[PDB]
Amino acid sequence: PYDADANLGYQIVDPTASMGENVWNMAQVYNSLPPELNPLRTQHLADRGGGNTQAAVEAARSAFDAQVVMEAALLQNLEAAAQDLPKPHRLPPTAGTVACNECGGAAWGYSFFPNTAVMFGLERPFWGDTLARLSKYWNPTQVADPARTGQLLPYGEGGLRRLLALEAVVGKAPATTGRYRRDLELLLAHPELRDGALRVPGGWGPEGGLQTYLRGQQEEQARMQRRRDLA
Amino acid sequence: QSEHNVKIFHNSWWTHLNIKNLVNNQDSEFINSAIIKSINNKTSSEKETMQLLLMSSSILLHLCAIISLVSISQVRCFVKFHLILLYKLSNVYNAILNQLSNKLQKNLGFLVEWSSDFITIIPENVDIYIWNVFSKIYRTIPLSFISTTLG
Amino acid sequence: LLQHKCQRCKGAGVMTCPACLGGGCRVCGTACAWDAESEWMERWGEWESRLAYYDKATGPLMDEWY
């Protein structure tokens, strides 16, 4: 592996030398990049044919480095949230949330006014208080009586249509896992696939893992079958 | 139960770097509003007393913090070392600009300081200059304060 | 001591869209990349491939064999 550059070099890094020497050795010749993204591997041929190989490599190394910087940002947020500090990196909202409309989404700030709640240590709210507030929030009270006020249905719209199998015995069916059904069936028709010697890549579609091995086996046994009869 | 060990190597890794400027794509009014509105809403001319108390105590907190910090001996050594380093760098830069501007207008060691007292090396001229500038800056405060608080 | 937080969101900077609690919502955010649950194992495959490069755990055995 050291000759094909498939793995990192022979003695580039030493766990007991120093940090400076190790970053020097790794910053030397694109040692921080895998072979697939190392530009030297491709710097010699790229021209009229496709115009892509040297482009579709610098356009992948960029996505790679973006992923790495995002990981650093997430870990700084987690390290701030490990204490009770406010997070340094404000990220945009996601698929279930909207932005606050008092702040713009900038969650906190600096103010030149000393924020006495921190200075005296009163920034956490005493469990019993929160318990009371929530228990009173999840229990709306009805003071009126539906006799006096002719209110027959609970609040909401279209109550009339709302007023008109064995899920109670075996629970509901989970609908997030249909995409694996097919493979499961295969794993029941071919018990021999559970042998302790085999270890496929892994995946669900016809392009991954179990089905790849199965198609390969059937195709190669058919190839050998046809090669038996010709002779 | 296994025993754990101290980790002394590339520890953390995510702190060696300032990445604040990349994530916000660069390439605090609700705060004060809420503070002041709250002290207005809760507790004539009483809002003015409360606001003046707030501002005064904040400035005093910052000043007390600074002075108490600078009152530790080692912090004074730190300050002195920085002062002499900056003075030598200013000497270099000023010499360069002076000589080259002289040219173009014709066209158009450290230990003797680091090992001595500092009030005997520095003249009184600079103390008088600092005091004069400060005095001149803050001399209009009584009239300003009076004219503000009287409607 | 000088850090203050928004009092509505309590320093989260983000509130919920309640309709999405019980052709989607047009008001609330955009999905992320690791939300597509059909592409999970492919992304993990690429990542473990790239990680096998740097991995220097088995270094001494490879060294003696080399």
Partner: peptide, 15 residues
Amino acid sequence: LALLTPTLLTLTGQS
């Protein structure tokens, strides 16, 4: 700042 703290402790929601 301990005089105003009951006032300024509404910005956090406590008493």
